[PDB]
Write a protein that binds this ligand. Structure first.
Ligand SMILES: *[C@@H]1O[C@H](CO[C@@H]2O[C@@H](C)[C@@H](O)[C@@H](O)[C@@H]2O)[C@@H](O[C@@H]2O[C@H](CO)[C@@H](O)[C@H](O)[C@H]2NC(C)=O)[C@H](O)[C@H]1NC(C)=O
Lengths: 215, 224
């Protein structure tokens, strides 16, 4: 069984840079290496076959090089849509067909400040006995952000769940969705609900709020 | 127009078995090998086996030898993979992949995937609740954000689609990872509508649709 090892395991580059991912084999596999690209939430796609042959319809910025043990995928001019995990695969000693561990490509860009939106629980959901208050941060970079919920200027801890997206395929930015969860009762016991967002594109923390039922 | 369309996501208890399908189109099903590869959450790709859709022959990987079974039905050009005695380690996305060439075999067409979640929970379709924004200082020239909240759905195989009140599609789908809480998942989608459109328009709502393997659901989201 031939083990494929990719290097680096995570790579950062800005749009327009040359990217070079390496795949090494435990033992010679001649030109029997294929390169695939998996974009978040999608299935792998064949980019290169036979080490240096481009699958019809794949952009020409992708290129394969190599023979024997050391192989290299090269992206001449990285573009925002090349965000993905790239995998190499050997078809020389089959079975088993073996893949590399994967190289995640992270696109680096300039700072972008989030756009913040607070959303109060819906009347329907309130009739369910639950109350979810949402706070959305939109198109920001870098990924590091802080969402702090405050009910009646009371810092809330243990009731909020967050979820960050993957880099956008056009602007390479992130978005985030924090959600506070109270019981309909608990929600009907307080007045002001706010989220304060901290991000280095904001010159100071940005709070957005709403008043219970004043909506 | 080569395409491989797989079955839907499934939740199975430990010890159970699952059979996933892969309907092929756009080529001669019997002339190309069909492999199966799986991807655990966050981890890489793992070859499972192949089937010759013409002879019925199979070759599995030792890890799965004795627990997997790959079949085909050439009349419906479909391929099958049944994994039994399911364990948590088997929660993953199972893909079918066509292979080409006989020397440098390469998986040139892949499927969409089929999530299999091995858990103790039960499956449920989502419940949709709208999200309308209520700011302390609404600005006319700023874009208008509306949203949809899906709750209590399992497995996490939801697809949020949005449509205008005039039926046409909304290509502003902002999608966030689901969140697990209480054995069931919850997700949030957001659409940002230009001000040029909500100002100059008299549409009162936008429709949030969600597709889940245990029931598709819809909800109207008011347009402030
Ligand atoms: C369906 O509506 C879209 C958008 O309409 C505007 O936005 C809606 C949310 C609602 O407020 C409507 O009342 C508004 O009129 C139409 O897309 C627009 O089409 C025009 C001309 O093609 C273009 O100038 C706009 O920029 C488009 N805006 C967007 C966001 O696409 C679309 O044409 C409508 N479809 C049909 C069949 O009527």
């Amino acid at each position: 069984d031939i083990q494929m090892t990719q290097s680096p395991s995570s790579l950062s580059a800005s749009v327009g840079d040359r990217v070079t991912i390496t795949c090494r084999a435990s033992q010679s596999i001649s030109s029997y290496l294929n390169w695939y690209q998996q974009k978040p939430g999608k299935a792998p796609k064949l980019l290169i076959y036979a080490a240096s042959s481009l699958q019809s319809g794949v952009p020409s910025r992708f290129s394969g090089s190599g023979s024997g043990t050391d192989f290299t995928l090269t992206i001449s001019s990285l573009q925002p849509e090349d965000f993905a995990t790239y995998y190499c695969q050997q078809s020389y000693s089959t079975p088993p067909w073996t893949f590399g561990q994967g190289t995640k490509l992270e696109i680096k860009r300039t700072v972008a400040a989030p756009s913040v939106f607070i959303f109060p629980p819906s009347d329907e959901q309130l009739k369910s006995g639950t109350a979810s208050v949402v706070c959305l941060l939109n198109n920001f970079y870098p990924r590091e952000a802080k969402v702090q919920w405050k009910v009646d200027n009371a810092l809330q801890s243990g009731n909020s769940q967050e979820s960050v997206t993957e880099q956008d395929s056009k602007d390479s930015t992130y978005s985030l969705s924090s959600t506070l969860t109270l019981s309909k009762a608990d929600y009907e016991k307080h007045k002001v609900y706010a989220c304060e967002v901290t991000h280095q594109g904001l010159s100071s923390p940005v709070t957005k709020s709403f008043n219970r039922g004043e909506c | 127009q080569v395409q491989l369309v797989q079955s839907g996501a499934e939740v199975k208890k430990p010890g159970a078995s699952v059979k996933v399908s892969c309907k092929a189109s756009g080529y001669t099903f019997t002339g190309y090998y069909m492999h199966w590869v799986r991807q655990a959450p966050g981890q890489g790709l793992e070859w499972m086996g192949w089937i010759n859709p013409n002879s019925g022959g199979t070759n599995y990987a030792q890890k799965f030898q004795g627990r997997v079974t790959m079949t085909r039905d050439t009349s419906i050009s479909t391929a099958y993979m049944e994994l039994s005695r399911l364990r948590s380690d088997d929660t993953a996305v199972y893909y079918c992949a066509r292979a080409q060439w006989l020397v440098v075999t390469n998986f040139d067409y892949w499927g969409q995937g089929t999530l299999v979640t091995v858990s103790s929970g039960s499956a449920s379709a989502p419940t949709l609740f709208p999200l309308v924004s209520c700011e302390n200082s609404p600005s006319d020239t700023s874009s208008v954000a509306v949203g949809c909240l899906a709750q209590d759905f399992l497995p996490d195989s939801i697809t949020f689609s949005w449509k205008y009140k005039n039926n046409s599609d909304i290509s502003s789908t902002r999608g966030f990872p689901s969140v697990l809480r209480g054995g069931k998942y919850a997700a949030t989608s957001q659409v940002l509508l230009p001000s040029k459109d909500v100002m100059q328009g008299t549409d009162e709502h936008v429709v949030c649709k969600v597709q889940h393997p245990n029931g598709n659901k819809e909800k109207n989201v008011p347009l402030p």
